[PDB]
């Protein structure tokens, strides 16, 4: 079965880094003349084909982007734990998803990325509270150390399956 996953979030929060880690298993830069956005995985004893839309962070109006996002069945909403604006942007991203899907019931996971960092401005309890208020899972991740990365995408698949 096919799963279309869309990664959204403010500029620089780690959308591309998370996707690259999920698919290619590395953080440091590599040079080899094409990137893959598809992965075959087993989740809860059943095989999945995952396609990932790693959205550009810079936002604008676009009917085409709306259609690309509308194609997604589930969404990772990503902020960085050292970026309070990216956290406060999450409400906007959820509203955006609900607009494009024309629904209040869209599979979603809240992701707090960069938990490897030496300092933090967004505390865990804030994010757990917000996710709970949305009725969605919350997962802290690090694209650098790979901590939680599999868990974030796999939990999103679990949410889609329950839809």
């Amino acid at each position: 079965t096919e799963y279309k996953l869309v990664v959204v979030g403010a500029v620089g929060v780690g959308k591309s880094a998370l996707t690259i880690q999920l698919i290619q298993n590395h953080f440091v830069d590599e040079y080899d003349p094409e990137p893959s956005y598809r992965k075959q995985v087993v989740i809860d004893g059943e095989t999945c084909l995952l396609d990932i839309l790693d959205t550009a962070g810079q936002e604008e109006y676009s009917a085409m982007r709306d259609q690309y996002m509308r194609t997604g069945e589930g969404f990772l909403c990503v902020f960085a734990i050292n970026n309070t604006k990216s956290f406060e942007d999450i409400h906007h991203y959820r509203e955006q998803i609900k607009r494009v899907k024309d629904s209040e019931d869209v599979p979603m996971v809240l992701v707090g990325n960069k938990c490897d960092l030496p300092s933090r401005t967004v505390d865990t309890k804030q994010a757990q509270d917000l996710a709970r208020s949305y009725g969605i899972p919350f997962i802290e991740t690090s694209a650098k150390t790979r901590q939680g990365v599999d868990d974030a995408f796999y939990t999103l698949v679990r949410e889609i399956r329950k839809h």
């Binding site: 084909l49 959205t55 690309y68």
Partner: peptide, 30 residues
């Protein structure tokens, strides 16, 4: 940045791979 065409003899899985690439590319250049 635009993905290369999949190839005339591309398998269904090859097309799936290309499609995911194009999905990302189109979003990026809007």
């Amino acid at each position: 940045r635009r993905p290369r065409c999949p190839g005339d003899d591309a398998s269904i899985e090859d097309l799936h791979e290309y499609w995911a690439r194009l999905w990302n590319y189109l979003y990026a250049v809007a």
